[PDB]
Amino acid sequence: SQSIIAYTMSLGAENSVAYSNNSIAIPTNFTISVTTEILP
Amino acid sequence: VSMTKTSVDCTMYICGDSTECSNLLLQYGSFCTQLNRALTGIAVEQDKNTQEVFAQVKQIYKTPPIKDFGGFNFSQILPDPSKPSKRSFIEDLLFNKVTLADAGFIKQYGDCLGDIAARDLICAQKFNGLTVLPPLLTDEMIAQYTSALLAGTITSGWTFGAGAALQIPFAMQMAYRFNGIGVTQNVLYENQKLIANQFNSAIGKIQDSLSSTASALGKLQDVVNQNAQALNTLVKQLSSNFGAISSVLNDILSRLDKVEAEVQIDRLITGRLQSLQTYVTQQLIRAAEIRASANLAATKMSECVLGQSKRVDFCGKGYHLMSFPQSAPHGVVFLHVTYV
Amino acid sequence: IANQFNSAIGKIQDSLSSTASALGKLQDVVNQNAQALNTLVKQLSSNFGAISSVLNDILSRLDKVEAEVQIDRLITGRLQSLQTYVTQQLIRAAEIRASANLAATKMSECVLGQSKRVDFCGKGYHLMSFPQSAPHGVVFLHVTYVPAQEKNFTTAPAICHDGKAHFPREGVFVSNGTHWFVTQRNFYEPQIITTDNTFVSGNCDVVIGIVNNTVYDPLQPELDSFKEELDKYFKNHTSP
Amino acid sequence: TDNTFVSGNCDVVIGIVNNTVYDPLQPELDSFKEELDKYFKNHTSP
Ligand SMILES: *[C@@H]1O[C@H](CO)[C@@H](O[C@@H]2O[C@H](CO)[C@@H](O[C@H]3O[C@H](CO)[C@@H](O)[C@H](O)[C@@H]3O)[C@H](O)[C@H]2NC(C)=O)[C@H](O)[C@H]1NC(C)=O
Ligand SMILES: *[C@@H]1O[C@H](CO)[C@@H](O[C@@H]2O[C@H](CO)[C@@H](O[C@H]3O[C@H](CO)[C@@H](O)[C@H](O)[C@@H]3O)[C@H](O)[C@H]2NC(C)=O)[C@H](O)[C@H]1NC(C)=O
Ligand SMILES: *[C@@H]1O[C@H](CO)[C@@H](O[C@@H]2O[C@H](CO)[C@@H](O[C@H]3O[C@H](CO)[C@@H](O)[C@H](O)[C@@H]3O)[C@H](O)[C@H]2NC(C)=O)[C@H](O)[C@H]1NC(C)=O
Ligand SMILES: *[C@@H]1O[C@H](CO)[C@@H](O[C@@H]2O[C@H](CO)[C@@H](O[C@H]3O[C@H](CO)[C@@H](O)[C@H](O)[C@@H]3O)[C@H](O)[C@H]2NC(C)=O)[C@H](O)[C@H]1NC(C)=O
Ligand SMILES: *[C@@H]1O[C@H](CO)[C@@H](O[C@@H]2O[C@H](CO)[C@@H](O[C@H]3O[C@H](CO)[C@@H](O)[C@H](O)[C@@H]3O)[C@H](O)[C@H]2NC(C)=O)[C@H](O)[C@H]1NC(C)=O
Ligand SMILES: *[C@@H]1O[C@H](CO[C@@H]2O[C@@H](C)[C@@H](O)[C@@H](O)[C@@H]2O)[C@@H](O[C@@H]2O[C@H](CO)[C@@H](O)[C@H](O)[C@H]2NC(C)=O)[C@H](O)[C@H]1NC(C)=O
Ligand SMILES: *[C@@H]1O[C@H](CO)[C@@H](O)[C@H](O)[C@H]1NC(C)=O
């Protein structure tokens, strides 16, 4: 039931940011993330 | 940010469908595979370069239908829906300045034979085994990435760079910028109509200048010109005898027997093989200049668009407030905003 | 913060115990240098138009003047195979040098410092990085603060109070819908708006979107409760 | 005294100049001394 498929690639998920002339979003919490960078 | 992807059939360039020349070319071993590997490595890197610069957003951000940005007017740099590609007004200006040669988007025989075949260099390249390959990202996809970078910036400031896009009013984002250059935020709010009118007028001068001067995108035109001049040089090296009785491989095979033709064909193989080794070395050297330029453009995207830079002269002249990316043919334009 | 760091370092260890191709940037360098040497050894199989690739089979079969014309063909192609290998290696050495110069800059700016440069030291706001050695490479484990659980607030650029416009010293004004606070901008931590949290500039006429609220002076009740201390002494001193 | 910080005496700094530095708590307590004084003077009357 597998096959090769061909498609136009997605660039990402779309997002309308909730902009208003007097609305702000402020983070109530944080995460600590560790990410790897590899260099020759 | 990139250059045209090229592929060559080393056998159709050197030997042009002679079986006698093809049997002689096998005696040189791996060189035609090496030349194809090197050009394939250059071509994959043009897509890599474009992904490093433009694909810096998680999500394709949209601007709100209510454009209340505190009197700042982004209409000339935001998408225009009236067009098949959703580019900005300034991105259409930029796409008119730089003249391309072959996008890779199918050449289909009847568009290339007959009356057209004389008045064209691209059909003379293609009839000699040389082909341009299309980019992985279309110009519409680069414009969607640039739309998302600009919508993320004007709706959320630097916050879409570090995590989720957090909305903030645009004049409050601009007051943050003012604190970041050592100016107190009341200097923005007490001068907001002036700061907005000066921004709106300075963006109007970008539109006017790009509508008026010819050579401003000469940095991108130089790249297209070099890649075209290198391919025209490579096609013209087929006129060279390299000491053979003719450069025309069929005239050698029409007039000479099996053993006389082999000595003349080896002279053409030697010079045409050296012409490809020269072209591929020059293109490998260029590809490193374009990479270094794309790595700089990706760093300017991160540090000038997704942030506010404290680095001097990194994001224009003055104290950096913010930058806006615009897509251009094989390049990027940053519109850098500075407090002077 | 310690448990989140300890768990994130645990996920580095788990991924490096689970996925294969993550070090593909370093494996590609080893693969390219090995493939370039295998290509150079294979070019010894090529005749370059001579009667054989094997130099001894030319010298075992041909006299001095016949052999020298065949050997010239092998010298020509083998010398060109080295000039190609060395040019390709000189072009690759410049890519590795640019990558080492970047890694030295990340060692200085991400390990020996804290970077304000966006996306130079991972994704998020940089805290610190840890170097780890790898075959022909370096790994940076970049630690970043990522803001996580955002809430919407109403906001204003200024507060109007005594006919004077007030601005945050550090922070931003926010409302939950009924009350106004100052918060630091990168973490929700709301405080009563005071003459210590804020600075004055001008009157309320100039600022687009200024809102009315009280701005507390903490010296006021410190002298208002003192105003009642005087009255209780004065009223007790009515007795003589 | 809200715009500025003190460090040391005037002997060390090359090019230091004399000026008044305002303490905004000073008149907020002097007008509170005149508030005490009028209370004391009025309460001499009984
Ligand atoms: C900020 O986000 C934190 C996550 O990054 C979050 O910490 C998590 O809190 C929950 C409880 O609310 C914990 O869940 C555990 O709670 C008890 C055991 O202590 C059990 O009953 C549960 O089944 C579960 O095991 C998480 O363990 C905890 N995560 C960490 C890393 O400690 C905070 O609560 C958030 N704080 C605020 C103020 O929003
Ligand atoms: C943001 O800046 C824009 C560029 O200056 C500006 O767009 C321009 O707006 C004017 C007035 O609406 C248009 O002028 C034309 O208006 C109608 C169109 O049917 C005609 O009857 C007029 O004769 C005149 O030609 C411009 O055409 C328009 N330019 C573009 C490129 O769209 C916006 O108005 C500014 N936005 C705000 C909120 O001020
Ligand atoms: C916006 O934030 C306000 C401050 O946090 C909040 O007001 C506070 O509401 C609580 C109840 O939820 C009150 O709590 C007190 O209630 C009585 C007061 O007599 C006492 O018996 C209790 O022990 C307790 O102290 C606070 O007094 C009140 N604070 C103020 C300054 O009014 C609002 O409710 C929040 N509004 C929204 C829309 O979330
Ligand atoms: C924020 O607080 C301000 C101070 O309390 C308040 O200003 C006051 O606004 C009203 C209505 O505009 C004015 O009322 C008077 O207007 C004229 C005379 O000025 C008369 O015709 C009216 O009958 C009435 O007497 C006040 O004069 C004005 N005060 C000052 C010092 O300017 C704002 O309205 C408040 N704004 C919001 C949105 O809450
Ligand atoms: C800045 O203000 C200072 C304080 O008012 C002032 O210092 C004073 O300077 C004078 C002149 O040098 C001194 O005058 C006395 O000098 C000796 C004794 O010290 C006597 O022989 C003199 O007759 C005279 O009484 C003050 O003693 C000195 N005060 C202090 C505390 O050091 C500066 O001169 C002012 N500088 C400028 C440039 O305005
Ligand atoms: C912040 O608010 C936006 C939109 O404004 C809100 O609209 C109401 C729904 C109500 O929440 C009001 O108090 C605000 O003024 C929220 O955006 C909506 O998100 C949902 C999905 O969660 C989506 O279905 C809606 O279409 C969105 N509406 C718009 C106009 O964008 C957003 O979720 C809030 N963000 C946070 C961090 O709480
Ligand atoms: C914000 O937009 C509303 C309309 O949604 C408008 O009535 C109001 O005057 C605007 N306020 C500011 C501060 O721009």
Ligand SMILES: *[C@@H]1O[C@H](CO)[C@@H](O)[C@H](O)[C@H]1NC(C)=O
């Ligand atoms: C005055 O008040 C004090 C307490 O404040 C009390 O100890 C004292 O007895 C009172 N004297 C008179 C005369 O009221």
Ligand SMILES: *[C@@H]1O[C@H](CO)[C@@H](O)[C@H](O)[C@H]1NC(C)=O
């Ligand atoms: C500045 O220069 C003047 C001479 O022009 C000199 O008299 C004075 O002492 C100097 N002051 C400082 C602060 O160096």
Ligand SMILES: *[C@@H]1O[C@H](CO)[C@@H](O)[C@H](O)[C@H]1NC(C)=O
């Ligand atoms: C003076 O003191 C009396 C009480 O003895 C009080 O009634 C009056 O209000 C005071 N007036 C002033 C001006 O202090």
